[PDB]
Structure 1
């Protein structure tokens, strides 16, 4: 009590459920968003199976599990299982009840209207939550990084968002939503692996791809020039003894899948690279508002952690684009967790009161209290 109220900081997506205690800086409790059943039948008696297996408990013992995925970048295949995903957050890891402290979540811009009330209903009209809010993904990282004037491109795993926020919100738009990040690359690898007697089919092993990915996979400085270099067996082939029992000397499999990012043609979409749409969104704004945008670019998310992601952007943009101001790309120490660094802030602020929703406020405006307060 005294000078302590304790506020939770959560940020869920399509890869990790980031959570902490109170006033923290970095995410303490983290676990994969998974929830399946026992295709096997639990021994059924050596426990009335139930618990789909979740948290650092399901990922530990995959194989047996029939992992089913609820949140495919935005759309939720089913909300009934979501109840048993949040039953793992506050209870197992955080070890605190939601009927005590507030709550903070993230908002993927342009989210279905039906999802607003559905989510809020799960808490207030069921699991008593005194107060909560659902802040907008990107905007959070802006302040934490210490930027006032920037163009943000937040992309962790779910979807891509080109948010030219550098002074205010809710203008025309200059924002886009693309389903081409993280999990999209995870499903693409197994496709091409078939050309080398490898086929990670189901979800259980599909997760292993993610593991092997974040330890060697890279983005070619220039696919065209590295083609002739492929002859050399030093900078391409990299041994990786699968901790299960298989040696895969990945060489041309590391920078072939990530290429899909710049080449949406490899997934059947007329959409251009992420540097074309960048122009598309900037041109719809004022004319005297660009010179400062190019000066400072905010690239956050785990997608920017790959080796050979920032340098390439400074090669293609400068080619066909205004060439007067300095070109600089900002990549903070841990540009992935930049969202959580800023997420913790708003939760620890007091001015935040004149924004969130209070217990009584809901009953005063009914279920439409959401779109009546926030937007």
Structure 2
């Protein structure tokens, strides 16, 4: 009765569904495209915004905007179009009778979740609401209560170290390098062969390139010496207009900026010594249980060979007696949602919602106290 909704509204992809299930009912990209050309036929027009899946079948006449950049909602009029699309047009539910479980990255602005609270209560009129952290929900879905979670998505990657249900907020690190900064590095790195992708609708083609041909080399300075001696690493890809491109050493140079972020001009360290500098800011008694429970979540952690590369780079930093086990589940793209369906369908969680009656005695500043 009154099954809750779990809407993980990440950057780049929106995953929604019902609480208590094991798979999302709605996975569509988080874009709102508007037409940029001149309409000549009468009737084609009077429709100035395509949201989600029909803005990628009809791209090529649209300019595609992302409302969430770096985990922060930049466009508050286009984010209401995606929430209106994912309730009525995509899930086919009425939000007046279901409580929703939203999802936010750590270390975001406090006025980002202050306006998600205002929108769901004064526009969609949900009975109850709750805003959770991403990397705490990918420990629910992993069968653990202790561990350190590297959650690499599209806007941000962050580490949250948790020991026996107790989080250490002084050791939560956050990078703004993520998967969308590997798409924009692949557009620049492909111009050395002649292929120039420019437009916003041509960035979705080079995004589909990195999901199919890109991988992580276990030894980078050796792999660049065998990518030039022979041509056994090259693979071909067919564009939507029939042209065939050929990619050589740009298959592993694109996910290598997660481990060497000096390729994009960032001064920060890689993701292998960000997940280690946050272990070494935890207390000494719990470091043996974080080396062995190293949960990897999110979509950008799905390259072939990102687990065997990351075990190589923490064992070179950790002491030689610790064993290091990296937990990469096969379904780790939807791990943040599955732990959201676990938490919202819980028997002891049902007194932790922010009810609509509670929203009147406070303002939108109640979400900081209750979450």
TM-score by length of 2: 0.95
Q: For the residues of structure 2 that align with 1:369 and 1:44, how far apart are their CA atoms? A: 51
Q: For the residues of structure 2 that align with 1:273 and 1:321, how far apart are their CA atoms? A: 15
CA contact (8 A) 1:140 1:343 kept: yes
Cα distance per residue 1:256-313 (max 9 Å; x no partner): 1111111111122221111222232222221121112112211112222111111112
CA apart distance, 1:238: 1.0
**Residue 15 in 1 paired to residue 5 in 2?**
no
CA apart distance, 1:22: 4.6
Cα distance per residue 1:137-167 (max 9 Å; x no partner): 1111212211122111111222011111132
More helix by share: 1
CA contact (8 A) 1:117 1:367 kept: yes
Cα distance per residue 1:342-373 (max 9 Å; x no partner): 11111212322221111111112233222232
Provide the secondary structure at the position in 2 that maps to 1:50. coil
TM-score by length of 1: 0.94
Provide the secondary structure at the position in 2 that maps to 1:367. coil
Q: For the residues of structure 1 that align with 2:110 and 2:273, how far apart are their CA atoms? A: 29
Unpaired runs of 5+ residues, structure 1, are none
Q: Which 10-residue stretch deviates more, 118-127 or 35-44?
A: 35-44
CA contact (8 A) 1:21 1:94 kept: no
Q: For the residues of structure 2 that align with 1:75 and 1:304, how far apart are their CA atoms? A: 21
Q: How many residues matched?
A: 371
Q: 1:346 to 1:202 in 2, by over 3 A?
A: same
CA apart distance, 1:175: 0.8
Identify the residue that residue 349 of structure 2 maps to in structure 1. 352
Cα distance per residue 1:175-221 (max 9 Å; x no partner): 11111111110111111111111111111010111112211211122
CA contact (8 A) 1:7 1:348 kept: yes
CA apart distance, 1:169: 4.2
CA contact (8 A) 1:242 1:248 kept: yes
CA apart distance, 1:232: 5.3
Q: Which 10-residue stretch deviates more, 41-50 or 117-126?
A: 41-50
Provide the secondary structure at the position in 2 that maps to 1:264. coil
Superposition pairs for residues 148-159 of structure 1, below 5 Å? 148-159=145-156
Identify the residue that residue 127 of structure 2 maps to in structure 1. 130
